[PDB]
């Protein structure tokens, strides 16, 4: 609703060719703050955002210890998953998983998550009520009772409702000014000379945060879809994000167009128009 | 902060 925190897991078995490899990344909204790579002789959780560095030794050890155990466990999980699907040792397989907690504009838990995939496909995920599971197939059903029997739900719920939000709130206060900065876009629109027909009008949105933004071109308050070429949102490499829609349609009367781009970094929805 | 997995938490 407002802020969120997720963790991402991969457990990849190298085609019959060795022990599996466990990775974990910590996300707050879109900022990445910790990473953990199984592959090394002295694996350890590492900072990724400046505001996590202040955290103490015991915290880094609690992380390192869980991802170190997860490493061990997920190998046995990979051995059980492949066993279900009668896959051979060689043998390139992957289980990914993302859980976390959602904060509203107030600062309380809106909902939590614990989904899984195996080999890129939805497997088992926690229902909104934080009590029930959803299995993909008869195999993910085998995993569901494994998990009901161990009451995993009741404990993910205790983490979601408790610790998770707890820490979210914590980081939030610590990395505020970057986490609660909300930077607006430097917008404009341009065109190249040698195009198909008329100006290659390009609606731009740059250096903004977070990623939430909306473009759409109009014919005096309109919604095109078919007449505008849109592009997906990318990072600027420096925490900021980018995105553009555009128009190069065969008809061009030049000065008579709008591009309503609204974002939580604006005091109002922007109307835009360029002058040579 | 990462949740910790208890025993018998495998797939």
């Amino acid at each position, epitope marked *: 609703g407002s802020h969120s925190m997720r963790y991402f897991y991969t457990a990849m078995s190298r085609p019959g060719r060795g022990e599996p490899r466990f990775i974990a990344v910590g996300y707050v909204d879109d900022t990445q703050f910790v990473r953990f790579d199984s592959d090394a002789a002295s694996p350890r959780t590492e900072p990724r955002a400046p505001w996590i560095e202040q955290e103490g030794p015991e915290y880094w050890d*609690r992380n390192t*210890q*869980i991802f170190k*155990t*997860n490493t*061990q*466990t997920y190998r*046995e999980s990979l051995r059980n998953l492949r066993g279900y699907y009668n896959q051979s040792e060689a043998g390139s397989h992957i289980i990914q998983r993302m859980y976390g907690c959602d904060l509203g504009p107030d600062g309380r838990l809106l909902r939590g998550h614990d989904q899984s995939a195996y080999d890129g496909k939805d497997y088992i995920a926690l229902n909104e009520d934080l009590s029930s599971w959803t299995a993909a197939d008869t195999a993910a059903q085998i995993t569901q009772r494994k998990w009901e*029997a*161990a*009451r995993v739900a*009741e*404990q993910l719920r*205790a*983490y979601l409702e*408790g*610790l998770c939000v*707890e820490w979210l709130r914590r980081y939030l206060e610590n990395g505020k000014e970057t986490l609660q900065r909300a930077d607006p876009p430097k917008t404009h629109v341009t065109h190249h000379p040698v195009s198909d027909h008329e100006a290659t009008l390009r609606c731009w949105a740059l250096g903004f945060y977070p990623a939430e933004i909306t473009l759409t071109w109009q014919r005096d308050g309109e919604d095109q879809t078919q007449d505008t070429e849109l592009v997906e949102t990318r990072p600027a490499g420096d925490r900021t994000f980018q995105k553009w829609a555009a128009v190069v349609v065969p008809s061009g009367e030049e000065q008579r167009y709008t591009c309503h781009v609204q974002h939580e970094g604006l005091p109002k929805p922007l109307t835009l128009r360029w002058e040579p | *902060h990462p*949740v*910790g*997995e*208890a*025993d*018998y938490f495998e797939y």
Partner: T-cell receptor
Amino acid sequence: DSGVTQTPKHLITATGQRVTLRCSPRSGDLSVYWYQQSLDQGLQFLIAYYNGEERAKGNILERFSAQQFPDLHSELNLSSLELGDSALYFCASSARSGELFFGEGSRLTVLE
Amino acid sequence: QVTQSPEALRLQEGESSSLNCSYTVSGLRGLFWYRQDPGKGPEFLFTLYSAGEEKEKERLKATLTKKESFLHITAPKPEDSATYLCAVQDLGTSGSRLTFGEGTQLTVNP
């Protein structure tokens, strides 16, 4: 009579000695949690195994060691005994919901 | 990291009383109350999971708060003579390990 099976219940040995406490988990439990309670002190977590397979490490000493064998039974070995080793060692078998089912403990008396 | 309050406890048969247990934890996986007699190893009485949870049970009632748990014994009979243990689990560590309190030694004068 929980399910865990500890032996030997009583051991008496000389300093600088070695002994080894057995333990068998509740049928159907795969873990083994070793504990030490020093007469009139608290229960301190020692070490813990899952299926193989060393799963956690409390405050076992450089000098003590243990394993969990193929079946599931554990063996904790206590080398170079000191007088202040004398105590009760409680093995436990977790699961699945997952309470810890303890054994009848085995009492170690180490003498000069 | 788990302390139990009345270390020693000395009650007349019939005299109710609540044994305290404090806890500091990252996130609480579980709180357990065990009963230990001399010689034998800890028996299971209760698990409590969420702040506000209570469990039966016979003369013993168990209670959980944010900061601690309470085992209220009603009308203690002499055979309730044992030392009583308190243990937590924590969502911040993997596995099922317990950290135990020191223990409350209860003696019911008949």
